[PDB]
Structures are given as structure tokens and as C-alpha cells.
Design a protein around this nucleic acid. Structure first.
Ligand SMILES: [K+]
Ligand SMILES: [K+]
Ligand SMILES: [Mg+2]
Ligand SMILES: [Mg+2]
Length: 156
RNA sequence: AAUUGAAGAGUUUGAUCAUGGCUCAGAUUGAACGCUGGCGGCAGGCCUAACACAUGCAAGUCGAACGGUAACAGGAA
């Protein structure tokens, strides 16, 4: 049901009296390929435990995306920290034209055709947050019609 | 029918986020070099010395403008 993807594993370190203590971090995303997506970030002493913590957090933090037949509704911009991303709907057969971190998010969410570009910092943790922030704020003609007090047909 | 279009990665720190340069993956060429080399089609071939040039060839034609006859070819001797 849920597609899981491991985006990045990093080794971090803190210093103590006896020397350095290493640990690992894991960044993952989960999604149902139909408009739901979440990301999790886990820390542990061993890689497998870090990944399992991340998968566990991701499943509890999914948001909803209003997709339009495997693509976006309109161009969107997302921002988080140094990361600025841009995404655009594309025609069928285009595929996912996106960088590695944006690709994992877009794919587990069910986006099949999209043109994307990451500006600024490409740190994966912040690119994922910016991507999901762009998808979560995307509007559909339904909600645009509702808030404006108009029918969908007068919108399109 | 004739705008179907947009990917990142490495490297500063014990580790982090940012900033910021450097480096890489692409496409291209009147190319050159190294190794190698079967055939065909279409194109392309002094980018440097507007340096100096042997030899041959690259502009003639008209006798229906004209006086003519060097030919050679006939007509006449
Ligand atoms: K270095
Ligand atoms: K850089
Ligand atoms: Mg930058
Ligand atoms: Mg020349």
C-alpha cells in the first residue's frame, strides 16, 4: 500500500571527554501514490535503527495533495531555510524531471509528470520540507471555486 | 498541424545550518593527437605566413564590319 523511500543517511558526531561519539541520521518519505505523502527523520547509533525510526515518524505525518491525473494543478513555489524549489505540471509521458530529493517525494505522492528545479541550498532535509510545503499549498479548481463563491465551470 | 518545457553531485567542520568559490556529469567543432580501422551514401577539408612562389592552365570571340592571303582545301593553270 505505502511506498517507502530512503533519501539520505548521514553520519554525525558529538565530542565527549573520551573522544568522539558517532551516530547516524536517516531521512525517508512514505506515500500511497495517490496524493498522500509524509517525511520522517530518525537518529540512532546504528543505521538500521535510524531508518526504522524515520519510517515510523513518516507514517504519522502524512499530508494530502490535490493531484490532477498524476500531475500538479498549477506551478508552485516552496521554501524552507535555504531551499527554494519550483514545480510545474507537465504533459503525459514527460516523467519526473527533478533532482534526487524532490524525485523521491514526488514519486511516493503519486506525481507522474512534473518539471521541477531546486534553487539555493540543496540540503536534502530542507529540500524535502520545501517540496512538501509546495505540494501542500497547491490549490484545486474545486477549492478555488468554493472559497470564491463560484461554480467550477465559471472558474475554468 | 507548425513554443512537449526546466534533475543534480563533490569539496571548508569534531559535527551542524548558511554563505561562497573551486571541480564534475551534458551538448557542440573547419578540429588536432594516441591506439585501432571493413564497406557505402551525402557533405566537409590552410583556422597559421594578406609569407615567398618553379611549371601548366583560369578570356575570348566575330570573315554575316574591313582591307586581305601566311597557311591547307578545293577550283582553275
Ligand atoms: K577537502
Ligand atoms: K558548493
Ligand atoms: Mg549555493
Ligand atoms: Mg586564410
Amino acid at each position: 500500500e505505502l511506498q517507502e523511500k530512503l533519501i539520505a543517511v548521514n553520519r554525525v558526531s558529538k565530542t565527549v571527554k573520551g573522544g568522539r561519539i558517532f551516530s547516524f541520521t536517516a531521512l525517508t518519505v512514505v506515500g500511497d501514490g495517490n496524493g498522500r505523502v509524509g517525511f520522517g527523520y530518525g537518529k540512532a547509533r546504528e543505521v538500521p535503527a535510524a531508518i526504522q525510526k524515520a519510517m515510523e515518524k513518516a507514517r504519522r505525518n502524512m499530508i494530502n495533495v490535490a493531484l490532477n491525473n498524476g500531475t500538479l494543478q498549477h506551478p508552485v513555489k516552496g521554501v524552507h531555510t535555504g531551499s527554494r524549489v519550483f514545480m510545474q505540471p507537465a504533459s503525459e509521458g514527460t516523467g519526473i524531471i527533478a533532482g534526487g530529493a524532490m524525485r523521491a517525494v514526488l514519486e511516493v505522492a503519486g506525481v507522474h509528470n512534473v518539471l521541477a528545479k531546486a534553487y539555493g541550498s540543496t540540503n536534502p532535509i530542507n529540500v524535502v520540507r520545501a517540496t512538501i510545503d509546495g505540494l501542500e499549498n497547491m490549490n484545486s479548481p474545486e477549492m478555488v471555486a468554493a472559497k470564491r463563491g463560484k461554480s467550477v465551470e465559471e472558474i475554468l
